Symmetry: C2
Subunit: 139 residues, 2 copies
């Protein structure tokens, strides 16, 4: 459990284009995300809130640091894979495994949806900023 | 099959916030997307190309028309639901149904990933345009 996901996710990400982002930051992000989605999962009543928090925050950070935000999507994707992999190992009951994997896939897909919204909102805010700058400054 | 998905998707979308977009356009988009993903599905060797085409094009259109691009994600999501619904009806063999639904879910998730990339690329291009405008014009 736990880190066994993280080190797996990280491993997959080791094989992927990092979009300029330093690998230690990549790893940290992976850890924050896994931590968040696990906090959400252990919950009763299906909470998406923690992962959402991490995502919003990290969108902010990413944009401030000037890195392509898509790199988060990738991370999520790999995390998903990681879970699947681990759950294929640890759970020999195919029904239980199927259910856990289904709920994880749910959480993740909703997470990437939220991620899309956030990234777009942010970039729009900036585009507007620059727009007002442009016009009210063409005086 | 076919339109039975579309009218279902549209129906779901009838219940959702359209983000300012006229409903006839919503419907058209739903149709283009269903058509594309079906063209991809009937293929052998797992092609994502057609849906990708539709997505890129529609990102362009959406941005030019000044509508929030997230509205495409929603459409995709509902389309997914539609398939599931239909496949729960038409296929009484749970194995076959499970497999078809799994491959559709694959196609769609990859589609939303691509959508994220595209939307971000576009908005970035604009942000940069405005940026050069800003600086080379602060002369």
């Amino acid at each position: 459990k736990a880190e066994n996901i993280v080190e797996k996710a990280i491993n997959l990400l080791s094989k992927e284009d990092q979009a300029g982002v330093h690998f230690n930051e990549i790893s940290a992000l992976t850890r924050d995300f896994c931590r968040a989605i696990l906090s959400d999962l252990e919950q009763s009543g299906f909470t998406t809130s923690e992962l959402e928090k991490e995502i919003a925050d990290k969108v902010k950070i990413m944009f401030a640091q000037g890195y392509h935000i898509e790199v988060l999507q990738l991370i999520l994707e790999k995390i998903l894979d990681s879970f699947i992999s681990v759950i294929r190992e640890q759970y020999h009951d195919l029904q239980a495994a199927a259910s856990y994997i289904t709920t994880v896939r749910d959480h993740i897909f909703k997470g990437t949806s939220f991620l899309l919204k956030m990234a777009l909102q942010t970039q729009r805010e900036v585009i507007q900023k620059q727009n007002e700058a442009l016009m009210e400054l063409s005086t």
